Amino acid sequence: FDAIPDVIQAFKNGEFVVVLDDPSRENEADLIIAAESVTTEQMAFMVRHSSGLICAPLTPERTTALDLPQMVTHNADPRGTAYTVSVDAEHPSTTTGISAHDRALACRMLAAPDAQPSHFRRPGHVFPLRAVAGGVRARRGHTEAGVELCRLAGKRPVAVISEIVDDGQEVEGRAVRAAPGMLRGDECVAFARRWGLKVCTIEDMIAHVEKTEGKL
Amino acid sequence: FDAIPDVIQAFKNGEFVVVLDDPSRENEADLIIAAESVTTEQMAFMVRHSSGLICAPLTPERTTALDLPQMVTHNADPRGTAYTVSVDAEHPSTTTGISAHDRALACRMLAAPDAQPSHFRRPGHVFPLRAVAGGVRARRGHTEAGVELCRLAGKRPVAVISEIVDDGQEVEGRAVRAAPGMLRGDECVAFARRWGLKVCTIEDMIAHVEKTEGKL
Ligand SMILES: [Mn+2]
Ligand SMILES: [Mn+2]
Ligand SMILES: [Mn+2]
Ligand SMILES: [Mn+2]
C-alpha cells in the first residue's frame, strides 16, 4: 500500500488512485479521481474497468449550490449511500449522456467553479453522491474518501468514483463471463500496479487525517 | 439484420438480442434480455460490454404493483427516459448490490410473478425504466423495445437493457482508453455476430407489431 501523501500527490496530478474500504465494510476497491479535469479517455478506462455506475462524490455545500436533491427521502440503502438525483451535462456537445465523453463532461461541469443548477439535466447518467459533513472519520466510505482526497490535494470538491469489479473470464463466442465478482485485497494492488496507479486503504486515509484532526 | 420472429425466438430462449434505435434518434444499440432468468454470468458479460448502467424496462402496471415511483417529478431528460427510483434486491445473498450476482438478482426479482414492493431496497444499483403504455409504436426507444420483446416472447413484463459502448483501445500500462465512443450500425451487427446473438432495428420491430396493430 502506498503512503497517503504519495496518494495525495498522484491525486493532485489528476490521476486515478485505487482505494480500498474496510474488509468488514464493503471490502471493495474503487477507482477515485478528481472530477475537475477527468478526460474522455480516462472516463473510457474507468467505464471499462469498473461497474460502470459512475458516481461523483461532492459536499453538502455543493449539493445545495447546485440544487441536487437526494434521490430518495427515505433512504433504504443499508449504508445510507447518499445518492442525489442523477444528471447529464446541459452542453451543446452532449448527446445521449452515456458515452465516456458525455459522462466525463458532466463530471467536470459539476466541479466547475462557476457551476450552476441550470448546467445539469435531471435525471441523467452520472450519479452525484453526498459526502457527510464529518468526512472520512465520520463515514468510512469511498464517497467521503473521494471528497477527502479533493480537499487533501487542493482540488474542486467533486470526485468521481466507481467500484473495480472482477469481470471474470471471456468465453469465446458466448454471451457470458465465467466466475465474475469484485476485485479484492491483493488483486486490487496488483490492478493498481498494472496501470501505474497508487493504491491505499481508507483506514490509512483516516490515520492521515487524524494527524491533523485527532480521532473523531 | 435478423427477422423479428427470429429475434423473438432468441429472446424467448433467454438470450440477449442486439437492438438498434433510429439513427436520427440515439443511433445506439442496446443489449436487451428477458429479466426473469438473467444469470450471474450473463450479467457479467452485460456489464463488461455495455455502459454498465444496467436498466430494467417494465410496464406501468409493474411500476405501480411494485411501488417504483419516477426518480423525478419534472423530467428534464430530452427523451423523457422514464427512470424510477433505483433498487437493490432485498435478499440474503445480496451484499453491496453492484456485483453481477447482485444486479442479476435484482433483475430476476423485479420480474418474479410473486414480486412485492418490500422485495426491493431503494435506492440501489439497478435502474427500472417505465415503458409508455402505447409501447414501441408510441415511443421508439429501447425501453419500449425491451418490454415489447417480453410481450412478444411471452415472458414476464420486465427486460434488462444497457447501451453497447465503444471502449476504444487499451493503452499498455496507462489508465486511459484511446478513441472511445458508442458502437454504431455495422459495428453493432458485427458485435452481435461475434457473440452469437440476433440483431435488429426497432424500426423493424415496429413493422412487426404493426402487422397486428396497424400504424399508431
Ligand atoms: Mn438513452
Ligand atoms: Mn464503496
Ligand atoms: Mn457501494
Ligand atoms: Mn436507448
From Swiss-Prot, chains A, B:
Binds 2 divalent metal cations per subunit. Magnesium or manganese. GO terms for biological process: riboflavin biosynthetic process. Mg(2+) 1 binds at residue 26. GO terms for cellular component: cytosol; mitochondrial intermembrane space. It holds the Pfam family DHBP_synthase. Mn(2+) 1 binds at residue 26. Its EC number is 4.1.99.12. Mg(2+) 2 binds at residues 26, 142. It catalyses: D-ribulose 5-phosphate = (2S)-2-hydroxy-3-oxobutyl phosphate + formate + H(+). Its cofactor is Mg(2+); Mn(2+). Mn(2+) 2 binds at residues 26, 142. The modification S-glutathionyl cysteine is found at residue 55. D-ribulose 5-phosphate binds at residues 30, 81, 139-143. Keywords: Glutathionylation, Lyase, Magnesium, Manganese, Metal-binding, Riboflavin biosynthesis. One of its GO terms (molecular function) is 3,4-dihydroxy-2-butanone-4-phosphate synthase activity. It comes from the Eukaryota. InterPro entries: DHBP_synth_RibB-like_a/b_dom (IPR017945), DHBP_synthase_RibB (IPR000422). The record marks 125, 163 as: Essential for catalytic activity. Catalyzes the conversion of D-ribulose 5-phosphate to formate and 3,4-dihydroxy-2-butanone 4-phosphate. NCBIfam families: ribB (TIGR00506). Homodimer. Belongs to the DHBP synthase family. This is 3,4-dihydroxy-2-butanone 4-phosphate synthase. It comes from Pyricularia oryzae (strain 70-15 / ATCC MYA-4617 / FGSC 8958). The gene is RIB3.
